[PDB]
């Protein structure tokens, strides 16, 4: 048995180049630079193997930030041009990320403003967006679809007889809940109304759906769990009761359903069985907003604070103070929390810092963004932008790419 | 405060 | 059932059919060529026993890291056997192990790890270095 062996030279020598390439594909950028300088044959393996292309492709596959940049910058066209092109591109991508991250930290952004031009009752209660469109629910009882690029209104959907309080859409349907106590299902392409669910006794304040199931919740203090075999075949599976006031928000995944209420509590339910699991106590007033993913629950309350929670043990991991009014909407991703308040202000929080109990509280709010003139009802964001909507009847796109 | 139909308490 | 594997040396190993068939190659020889025993001209007895041991245990964790505390020559032979037998799980952990010996090191430290001579001209090295 030999003591040492040049794997990267030896493998191509026997006609096994791909194994050598596969070993090197595990290197981070800086180690791939090192490998290039080990010797001429190592360089040839990385170069003939298009390792820089493979490294950029691995990032696009594993990091939505890199995926988003590949599409937004246009170099994604070259993925899936010599090796040296990708090697020279890689630092430009790094610098691009750095400038984007700096823009977030420093609040540097451009701003687009849609005036919804509501004739009577002003305000946009809810919204969801993609690269093509913004779907928005309005206090004038309609859903307006806006072109993400031209900001023009492409479709108005009518049928609800009260405000459109909540909405979500996927590749097939839009589902909306309303002050008129109904849930409606719309075709995302044509807007045709496909179904109406009569069940709740009071305004439908929130809903979520995914993978053939939906959860709805209501001012009537109940939660409804639905099985959706199709847009037109939707059956009630269970009603969850136990909250003592309006249920303002619901989220779920395959493990748990999570509901929060004016009664100051968050409740956790088993998705498979619909059995109550536990109550999260701690907020001193009603809870207005919430998002749940993995093990993390983030909630916003009339007590002006944000709380972070572990779903399994129910522990509150962090209290976020700083908002001066009711925290009315909140979202998070892998890096940030973004929250909106009744005073029109939006705050960006450092989520990693917030989940580290060593970090001081004053370092947790990264930026305050002040461009709405009324209560912020809903927002959604990603690596590059925030889309927010307000009682002031506007939708804002905050863009941190330039 | 009821000028927000999206949330409620009490 | 058990199937006899025949190493390049000639030593025969009795192995359970479900362990053997983690190698698609050995599976193809069984299911499609109906071969008994299964000759393995490219794997000697010492490496084959190492592979059989790994396959049974797995019918990159801590046990594999201990399993791979061998010299680079043996790790190289294991990579080749895993390729020849097409045991993706074994090929992945051995290849990841080599990558872990590369990562976080200067070129000089990599050379020293693997006993590699720097064969760049000064001019060639400066050019490669300029492009990082
Ligand atoms: O007893 C106490 O110590 C005490 C004393 C003073 C105030 C309070 N709390 C609240 O007034 C309150 C409201 S008011 C409200 C309503 Cl009803 C409808 C629309 C908009 C608003 Cl802002 C809404 C929610 C939420 F769940 F919706 F978020 N939670 C709350 O706690 C408690
Ligand atoms: Cl109240």
Numbering used by the authors:
A (entry chain A): 138 to 217, 227 to 548
B (entry chain C): 29 to 38
C (entry chain B): 2 to 60, 67 to 139
Question: Can you provide the manuscript's text about this entry?
Answer:
The phosphorylated Ser33 and Ser37 in β-catenin are part of the phosphodegron sequence (DpSGφXpS) that binds to the F-box-containing E3 ubiquitin ligase protein β-TrCP, leading to β-catenin ubiquitylation by the SCFβ-TrCP cullin-RING ligase and subsequent degradation by the 26S proteasome. While disruption of β-catenin phosphorylation frequently accounts for elevated protein levels, mutations in β-TrCP are rarely observed. These β-catenin phosphodegron mutations including Ser33 and Ser37, impair the ability of β-catenin to effectively bind to β-TrCP leading to its stabilization and thereby facilitating an enhanced oncogenic transcriptional program. In this study, we report the prospective identification and rational structure-guided optimization of potent molecular glue-like small molecules intentionally designed to enhance the PPI between mutant β-catenin and β-TrCP that potentiate cellular degradation of an engineered mutant β-catenin in a cellular system. To characterize the interaction of mutant β-catenin with the ubiquitin ligase β-TrCP, we developed a fluorescence polarization (FP)-based binding assay utilizing β-catenin phosphodegron peptides (residues 17–48) and recombinant β-TrCP/Skp1 complex (referred as β-TrCP subsequently).
